[PDB]
């Protein structure tokens, strides 16, 4: 648990259109919707042996390579598989929320998905204090993964060069250098095929 420098793979996912969709229902409904979603994401992360760092509203942060050790290639394989399984889940969910009147039906479009994945060094371990301490990762690598998730287009998966080097060339749909805050050197990003 004690914080230490380690090569890990960070995954940030987030959905847009949740509050808009929940704006209709009451408290009970908003909670059901969110829990439904959160459960699916968690399932995708665990099934791929990933670590659910935390939830940030309707955003999810997962780690691969901590606390349990994992090779750089497995970290990426599993991070990618999680991101793709998440998308399939959102498709299933959106299908259900549409047949149920929460989508398509009159001004609350389906919920779009955004996922960012990066691999790099990060101080990982327990951070906080006596009042509160949580297991997480800190550092530019984490910052980068978060910025990729926010920079990518709707319903897509964007990764860094460090991650893409383990991905079959035919799976990289688009390449583009992005200027990310706090980073001087432009970052080469790669949108990957959400299927396989």
Strand, helix or coil at 10? Answer: strand
Tell me the helix, strand and coil percentages in the chain, rounded to 5.
Answer: 35, 35, 30
Q: Determine if 67 is a binding residue for a copy of itself (CB under 8 A).
A: no
> Is position 20 an interface residue for ligand APC (rule: CB under 6 A)?
yes
Q: Is the dihedral of CA 131, 137, 138, 143 positive or negative?
A: negative
CA 154 to chain centre: 13
When asked if residue 132 is in the footprint of a copy of itself (CB under 8 A), the reply is yes
Binding site for Ca(2+), residues?
14-15, 58
166 binds a copy of itself (CB under 8 A): no
Task: Build a one-symbol-per-residue string for 40-59: x at contacts with ligand APC by CB under 6 A, - elsewhere.
Answer: ----------------xxx-
Q: Which of 11, 17, 148, 160 binds ligand APC (CB under 6 A)?
A: 17
Cα–Cα nearest to 7, from 56, 79, 114: 79
State which residue has the least CB distance to ligand APC. Answer: 57
State the Cα–Cα distance between residues 6 and 19, nearest whole angstrom: 36
- What residue 181 binds from Ca ion, ligand APC, a copy of itself, none (CB within 5 to 8 A, per partner kind)? ligand APC
Cα–Cα distance for residue pair 79/49, rounded to 1 Å: 9
| Residue 45 touches a copy of itself, criterion: CB under 8 A | yes
Beta strand 59-64 with 133-138 is: unpaired
C-alpha of 185 from chain center? 23
Residues that bind a copy of itself (CB under 8 A): 2-5, 19-20, 22-23, 26-28, 30-31, 34-35, 38-39, 42-43, 45-46, 52, 54-58, 123, 125, 127-134, 136, 138-140, 142-143, 182
Residues that bind ligand APC (CB under 6 A): 14-20, 56-58, 61, 136-138, 142-143, 146, 181-182
């Amino acid at each position: 648990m004690r914080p230490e420098p380690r090569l890990i793979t960070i995954l940030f996912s987030d959905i847009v259109g949740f509050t808009r969709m929940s704006n209709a229902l009451q408290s009970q409904g908003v909670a059901e919707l969110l829990n439904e979603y959160l459960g699916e994401m968690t399932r995708a992360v665990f099934e791929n042996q990933g670590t659910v760092d935390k939830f940030v509203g309707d955003a999810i942060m997962a780690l691969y390579g901590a606390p349990e050790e994992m090779s750089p290639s497995e970290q990426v394989r599993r991070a990618i598989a999680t991101a793709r399984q998440m998308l399939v889940a959102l498709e299933k969910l959106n299908q259900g929320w549409q047949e149920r009147g929460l989508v398509g039906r009159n001004e609350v479009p389906p919920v779009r998905f955004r996922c960012g994945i990066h691999q790099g060094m990060a101080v990982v371990g327990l951070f906080g204090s006596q009042e509160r301490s949580d297991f997480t990762a800190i550092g530019p690598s984490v910052n980068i993964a978060a910025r990729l998730q926010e920079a990518t287009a709707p319903n897509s998966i964007m990764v860094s060069a460090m991650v893409a080097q383990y991905v079959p060339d035919e799976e990289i749909i688009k390449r583009e250098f992005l200027e990310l805050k706090g980073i001087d050197e432009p970052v080469m990003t790669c949108v990957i095929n959400p299927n396989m």
